[PDB]
């Protein structure tokens, strides 16, 4: 299209592949993690990004993902050492406050709820855990959820409600919520459509839609239909049902490892194993039951190896960050 994806900065720091990047809630700081078992916190000084602090010795194995609390004071890191660590600054220096254990195997993902009072993890052991966050060293396990039949890749909390979405090697996405009467966490829905591993999931602004990305080289848009919906979608269990209302096919050569839906612009970014970053925008005339999403720009050689993650800046509209197996982090500006 007429859009453009412009490179602004290229950063390294880590030795080896970089698995994840995560913007701080205020957009002038981000964290990165990788194979080298370190977390790096980067900050903007003028027009130059640089590593401000390095968090080593928190994990004995690969760090797969980091996410900031919504308040920006806490960082959670998920590691192949079967633990999740929580970091915060109280002395002026980031320190590890607590370590959450319990998974049998590698922890793949971590996610904070909107209020910051809940924390979710998922593992190669096929389970999803939900923790209640009550203090800097005060965590109680609220649920251990085993609906998935294979390694669980990602967990993402709903932007408005305490709904948890999980994506799995078993090709499905699942939705969790507290049962009203007794407040037990249970599985509310299963999203079936992808023909291979679901790597990434992200909600749109109001949380009424979800975008997923898969080893099957497609991304899908899911819409939620609540009981009593006008559209006539059946809700037999009196639960919200999600239906695949759009599939974007033929745009990715290899597995799509991450997808990010910008709450400020509504743009969708994908990270692909073919080294490409692609940007999608909803069509002006698209119908809510059959939306159309068009690629407005791309950078097919964005990195020199697989792109592992793409993340929209939560404050700076149109600013994107990516990281790659090539050992680089890149910061981009998208113009429509």
């Amino acid at each position: 299209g007429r859009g453009r994806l412009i490179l602004e900065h290229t950063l390294q720091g880590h030795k080896g592949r970089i698995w994840g990047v995560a913007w701080h809630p205020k957009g002038n700081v981000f964290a990165s993690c990788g194979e080298d078992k370190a977390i790096r916190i980067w900050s903007l000084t003028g027009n130059t990004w640089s590593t401000k602090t390095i968090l080593s010795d928190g994990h004995k194995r690969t760090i797969r993902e980091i996410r900031w609390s919504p308040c920006g004071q806490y960082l959670a890191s998920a590691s192949f050492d079967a633990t999740t660590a929580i970091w915060s600054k109280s002395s002026g220096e980031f320190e590890c406050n607590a370590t959450l254990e319990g998974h049998e195997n590698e922890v793949k993902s971590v996610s904070w709820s909107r209020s910051g009072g809940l924390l979710a993890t998922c593992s190669r052991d096929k389970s999803v855990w939900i923790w209640e966050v009550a203090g800097d060293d005060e965590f109680e396990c609220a649920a251990v959820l085993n609906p998935h039949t294979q390694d669980v890749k990602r967990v993402v909390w709903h932007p408005t409600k305490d709904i948890l979405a999980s994506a799995s090697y078993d090709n499905t996405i699942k939705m969790f919520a507290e049962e009203p009467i007794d407040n037990d966490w249970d599985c509310t829905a299963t999203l079936t459509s992808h023909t291979s591993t679901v790597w990434g999931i992200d909600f749109d602004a109001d949380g009424e839609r979800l975008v997923s990305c898969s080893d099957d080289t497609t991304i899908k848009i899911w819409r939620a239909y609540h009981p009593g919906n006008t559209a006539g979608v059946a809700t037999p269990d009196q639960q919200t049902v999600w239906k695949c209302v759009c599939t974007v096919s033929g745009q990715h050569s290899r597995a799509i490892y991450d997808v990010s839906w910008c709450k400020l612009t509504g743009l969708i970014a994908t990270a692909c194993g073919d080294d490409g970053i692609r940007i999608f925008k909803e069509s002006s005339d698209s119908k809510p039951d059959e939306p159309t999403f068009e690629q407005i720009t791309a950078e097919e050689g964005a990195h020199d190896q697989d792109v592992n993650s793409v993340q929209w800046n939560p404050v700076v509209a149109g600013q994107l960050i990516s990281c790659s197996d090539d050992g680089t982090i890149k910061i981009w500006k998208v113009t429509e």
Partner: protein, 143 residues
């Protein structure tokens, strides 16, 4: 990607490019002498790897290995494919995308074995296992 470039268009980057490299034989030489985990023979001697089951394009940083387990219920199929992955990871420059798949129709569980071998996250976790990496290095080392 996926759907090909419209035939009427040529990629501008490509046009300028058009304006020594790895071949099947070189790749075959890298993996033909990998040892079987259980037997004192090479993957070539067991008909597990063959030159004609190798596909490579240097310019597009891609190599594809098809391997044939010795039996349709082979319990070592993932370990064999993983040893191929490790060999090519070390020997080839890091730009290369390596795909290792069971030859179609030659294993009762080929879909599930292929899916594991193609999951770079699970492969990376597996290669952090000191025991597994040791066994794989044993298989790879030529004699």
């Amino acid at each position: 990607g996926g759907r090909p470039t419209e035939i009427e268009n040529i990629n501008p980057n490509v046009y300028d490019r058009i304006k020594d490299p790895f071949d099947k034989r070189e790749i075959f030489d890298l993996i033909r002498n990998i040892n079987d985990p259980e037997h004192p023979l090479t993957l070539e001697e067991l008909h597990v790897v063959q030159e004609d089951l190798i596909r490579i394009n240097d310019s597009q940083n891609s190599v594809h290995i098809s391997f044939t387990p010795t039996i349709p219920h082979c319990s070592m199929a993932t370990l064999i494919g993983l040893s191929i992955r490790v060999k090519l990871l070390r020997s080839l420059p890091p730009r290369f995308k390596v795909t290792v798949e069971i030859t179609p129709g030659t294993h009762a569980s080929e879909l599930a074995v292929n899916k594991q071998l193609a999951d770079k996250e699970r492969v990376a976790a597996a290669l952090e296992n000191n025991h597994l990496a040791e066994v794989i290095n044993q298989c790879i080392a030529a004699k």
